[PDB]
Amino acid sequence: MNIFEMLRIDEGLRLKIYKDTEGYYTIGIGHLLTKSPSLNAAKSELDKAIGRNTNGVITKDEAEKLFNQDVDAAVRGILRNAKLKPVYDSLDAVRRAALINMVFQMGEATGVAGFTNSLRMLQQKRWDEAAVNLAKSRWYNQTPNRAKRVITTFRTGTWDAYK
C-alpha cells in the first residue's frame, strides 16, 4: 500500500464529469474542476487541464496523469506550509500518507493547517488523543467512512483500515 493506492481507494475513478460529495464538478480520481455551478465552466476547466477539446470525457491515462500532478501538488503544498511542514517531517511514512490524504481531499493546505490542536497532538505523537480531536470536525461528520479510515491510519501507523 502507498499514497496512490490509498487515494485511489478513497476517491474512486470516474472518466466523465461528476459531482463530488459537496456537489462540485470533478473528474478522474477526485480532481476538482470548479466550485462553480456551471457545467460549461467545468468543461472549460477540463479542457484547459487536459490540453484538448474533451467534451466532458477523458481517458484512463489522462485521469492518471491528473492524479499524479495532484499528488505532487498536495505534497508540495504541505512542504511549503509553515504549519504543516514540521508535522509532516515529524511523522513516519505511513502517517505521512494520512496527512497527504487530508490535504488532497480538502484540496488545499490551508484547510488542514487550520486543525491546530490536532496538528499539535500529532506532532507530540499522542495518537489516541489526536484521533478523538480529529473526529470533532465537519470533515468527519460529512464523509465519516473515509475520515474513519484516515483517522485509524494516524492512530495506528498501519494500513489496516485499507486492507
Curated annotation (Swiss-Prot):
Gene3D superfamilies: 1.10.530.40. Changing N133I: 5-fold decrease in enzymatic activity. The keyword Cytoplasm does not apply. It is an enzyme of class 3 (hydrolase). One of its GO terms (cellular component) is host cell cytoplasm. Its EC number is 3.2.1.17. This is Endolysin. It comes from Enterobacteria phage T4. The gene is E.
